Design a protein around this nucleic acid. Sequence first.
RNA 1: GCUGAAAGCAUCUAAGCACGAAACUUGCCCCGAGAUGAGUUCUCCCUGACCCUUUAAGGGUCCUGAAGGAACGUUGAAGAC
RNA 2: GAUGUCGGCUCAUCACAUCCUGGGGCUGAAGUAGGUCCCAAGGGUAUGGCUGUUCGCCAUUUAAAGUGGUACGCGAGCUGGGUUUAGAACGUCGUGAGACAGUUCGGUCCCUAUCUGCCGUGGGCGCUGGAGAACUGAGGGGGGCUGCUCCUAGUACGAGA
RNA 3: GUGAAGAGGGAAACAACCCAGACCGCCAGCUAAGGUCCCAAAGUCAUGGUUAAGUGGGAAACGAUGUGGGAAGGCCCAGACAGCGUCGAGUCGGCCUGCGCGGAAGAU
Lengths: 207, 168, 141, 38
Amino acid sequence: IGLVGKKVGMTRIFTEDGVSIPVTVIEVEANRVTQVKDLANDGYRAIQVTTGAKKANRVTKPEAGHFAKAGVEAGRGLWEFRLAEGEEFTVGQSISVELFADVKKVDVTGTSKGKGFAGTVKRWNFRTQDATHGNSLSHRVPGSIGQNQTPGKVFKGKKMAGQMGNERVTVQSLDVVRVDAERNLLLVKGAVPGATGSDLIVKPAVK
Amino acid sequence: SRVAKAPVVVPAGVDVKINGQVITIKGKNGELTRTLNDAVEVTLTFGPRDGYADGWAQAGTARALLNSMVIGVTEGFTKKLQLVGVGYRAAVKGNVINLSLGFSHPVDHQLPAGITAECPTQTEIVLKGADKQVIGQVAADLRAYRRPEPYKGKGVRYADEVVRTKEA
Amino acid sequence: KTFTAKPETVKRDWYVVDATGKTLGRLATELARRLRGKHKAEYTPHVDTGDYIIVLNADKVAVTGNKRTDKVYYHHTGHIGGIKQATFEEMIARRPERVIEIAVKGMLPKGPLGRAMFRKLKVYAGNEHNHAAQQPQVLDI
Amino acid sequence: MKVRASVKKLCRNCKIVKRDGVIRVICSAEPKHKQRQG
RNA sequence: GCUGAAAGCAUCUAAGCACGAAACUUGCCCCGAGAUGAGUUCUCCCUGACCCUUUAAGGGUCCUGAAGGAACGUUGAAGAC
RNA sequence: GAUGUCGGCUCAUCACAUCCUGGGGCUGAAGUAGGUCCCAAGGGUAUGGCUGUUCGCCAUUUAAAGUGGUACGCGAGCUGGGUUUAGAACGUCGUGAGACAGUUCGGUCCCUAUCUGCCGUGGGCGCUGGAGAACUGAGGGGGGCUGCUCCUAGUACGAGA
RNA sequence: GUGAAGAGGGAAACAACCCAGACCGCCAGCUAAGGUCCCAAAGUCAUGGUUAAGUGGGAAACGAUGUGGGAAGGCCCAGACAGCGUCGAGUCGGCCUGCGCGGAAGAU
Ligand SMILES: [K+]
Ligand SMILES: [K+]
Ligand SMILES: [K+]
Ligand SMILES: [K+]
Ligand SMILES: [K+]
Ligand SMILES: [K+]
Ligand SMILES: [K+]
Ligand SMILES: [K+]
Ligand SMILES: [K+]
Ligand SMILES: [K+]
Ligand SMILES: [Mg+2]
Ligand SMILES: [Mg+2]
Ligand SMILES: [Mg+2]
Ligand SMILES: [Mg+2]
Ligand SMILES: [Mg+2]
Ligand SMILES: [Mg+2]
Ligand SMILES: [Mg+2]
Ligand SMILES: [Mg+2]
Ligand SMILES: [Mg+2]
Ligand SMILES: [Mg+2]
Ligand SMILES: [Mg+2]
Ligand SMILES: [Mg+2]
Ligand SMILES: [Mg+2]
Ligand SMILES: [Mg+2]
Ligand SMILES: [Mg+2]
Ligand SMILES: [Mg+2]
Ligand SMILES: [Mg+2]
Ligand SMILES: [Mg+2]
Ligand SMILES: [Mg+2]
Ligand SMILES: [Mg+2]
Ligand SMILES: [Mg+2]
Ligand SMILES: [Mg+2]
Ligand SMILES: [Mg+2]
Ligand SMILES: [Mg+2]
Ligand SMILES: [Mg+2]
Ligand SMILES: [Mg+2]
Ligand SMILES: [Mg+2]
Ligand SMILES: [Mg+2]
Ligand SMILES: [Mg+2]
Ligand SMILES: [Mg+2]
Ligand SMILES: [Mg+2]
Ligand SMILES: [Mg+2]
Ligand SMILES: [Mg+2]
Ligand SMILES: [Zn+2]
């Protein structure tokens, strides 16, 4: 399984031998098990977890009854982790960042920063046409988008301008630099998706 | 046809069991089972069933296979391999053959159920088993690690085989 | 005037068929016939007069020749270069119900009514169905 | 392997064999005589 | 390649068995139930009266207005809207 | 009662008769490195000098600098050097006006996208009481390149190299 | 000869090919070419053969113990054909012909 955390920000760890390690600081508070899915009832094995806190006025009655059945306080959302055949968990169990004590590498999933409507230069690394030499109104424009009468259409998946970022991204195989159970912190080497304050899903590295 | 006509003489201390198509020959070396082709009509005697155009061809193979099964569960089959090469070595440890064949890594060949191996010398392997197909396959697999080289004849050879060398 | 069946007074019965060992296409023509209602005297081209048919053991349907390995199912994803294929044996392994469903679909009329006719076919990979409440009669195709 | 439209015995030790719908020449004596029709 | 007849031999093949590549199916990442074949699981909410009439998944009247939603406002590392 | 025509730029997409990388048979294959044929389309597959050039030659890279189809892909996407308007001149032909599958200098490239398509992003209704969530995964897409050095080992191979 | 100046049915679609020449109406019947497992009207028709290649449902010289049929040969129980230092009946390879196989690489 993995845990849900929050991107606190980036800093560095100086080592004794004079290496500066860039780190993302992930706050991993206790993940509380809200539901256990099994083959009989649900058709697959998983835990649902919550973390953090939510204002009682913002917790709806359907949300509140779901937490109340688990016997846990409401957190800021619900996330599932699939269980391997060995793994087993109880409803209401707390899972801390100590899970990662002996984990060397993690995959971190988050929502990437939102670039809004992006051109082909930014979105797809298209090359600009001439700034000068007679270019008429066609500096950052995409150029040709197809052939001619054959095929007489644009193909699906054609790289064009549009929404960029604000989507789920996983960065794989990041070194775990420190697990600080006391302060509820995981330090991973290098950058992870999303803005400061955003939710992160951290799992032991699949590769 | 000619092969299919010839009857397989069942010796003493072998209990044949025709379960229709599934024939199971239990002897002193061990037991061997073989389901046959539908065209065959299995002393032991083999012949074609009606409405199969390749009945005699299928009868001849079935005869040949059960002949080998009878030899298998009585006396059994042996296949010898020789190693030719500076530093080429073999050694059995239970049911795994460890081979040194001039590679940077070890070569450990796990034997299947039935087959047993003995190294009388370090450059000889001697396989033994009831099933003629399986002992053939293991010997081919061991040979495949380092097939006889055409210049100096180096590699895992069968003891019988002639390696036709040539010179540069 | 010649009789016409009426959608709201059509009698549709439930049947269960075992596909085990049956030749795919020779099974499919009989399913298509009965889903369309061509076996009924009240057959009307613009009305679904056919029957509900459960097919069991779709994974044990038979084909002749070398079709188990050599019969290829093609589809295109709509993305350029997106021509995909699966052999009969691959289809049976992954999605066995689709073999019978695809065979029958190609033998049913094209258009809204043919799609409605196909909804009456219930194909299962194994020997059990969930439709005991519909009381399906055994049908030997 | 020689891949040819015309495959034939090149010596006495050559044998014609059909394998998986392909005419082949296999030779016990000479590896150069190995042929596949194609 | 193994075993193996047809074809007493031989034969990788006809029956049977094994190996074999960045191609194929997976494994990795993302979308994804308008998957109309519209799936599953968990939780939450509503427990009045009455009338007429081609009498049927019929149409009103009074009372009731939940869960939740939307709207509005302050806004955002979200965003052309 | 007009289907814009060379080259470049931008953006491509397919074929496989494969340039590289992968697998393999034969070799007049010792090894190293090649030759030749078979399989293989996953990904990858130069920058410059000269010329309008495509190409080509040349310099220097690279694992490689593939071959073709796509209106010799792509001007309602850009350019406008070439080329085929009007000016002018040379050579040449012609008595001349003028002319040249000769050369030379100069010389206007329009369009606010309705439909299809494509990239994004909402609204509606549906999914059978209504509602808030978490999902399963049919199906679809992305990705898939490779150098050099060291060890194995100066080992196998080789008379050495 | 047809189209042009000709509709209808067949050949998926297809002026010019095949069948056939539309005066109007019919919710009658018989046929033509072409068809009769489902899309889609009518044989999952009957009898005897062939093919195993999805050949049928592209492609030649040429290549091959694929497989069916036919006529005639050589050798052979004085023992043939591989074993022929062997035992116990077929064996060899031309000819003709039916149907298949390889030869067979292309761009949404
Ligand atoms: K749904
Ligand atoms: K191209
Ligand atoms: K080679
Ligand atoms: K490729
Ligand atoms: K142009
Ligand atoms: K245009
Ligand atoms: K323009
Ligand atoms: K249109
Ligand atoms: K006429
Ligand atoms: K075909
Ligand atoms: Mg933004
Ligand atoms: Mg540029
Ligand atoms: Mg302008
Ligand atoms: Mg400008
Ligand atoms: Mg089109
Ligand atoms: Mg139709
Ligand atoms: Mg093969
Ligand atoms: Mg043999
Ligand atoms: Mg690679
Ligand atoms: Mg016009
Ligand atoms: Mg090729
Ligand atoms: Mg590709
Ligand atoms: Mg492909
Ligand atoms: Mg792959
Ligand atoms: Mg150049
Ligand atoms: Mg062009
Ligand atoms: Mg091109
Ligand atoms: Mg254009
Ligand atoms: Mg110009
Ligand atoms: Mg002039
Ligand atoms: Mg323009
Ligand atoms: Mg995929
Ligand atoms: Mg893809
Ligand atoms: Mg005229
Ligand atoms: Mg006509
Ligand atoms: Mg007509
Ligand atoms: Mg027609
Ligand atoms: Mg009639
Ligand atoms: Mg007729
Ligand atoms: Mg019919
Ligand atoms: Mg019949
Ligand atoms: Mg064909
Ligand atoms: Mg041919
Ligand atoms: Zn030869």
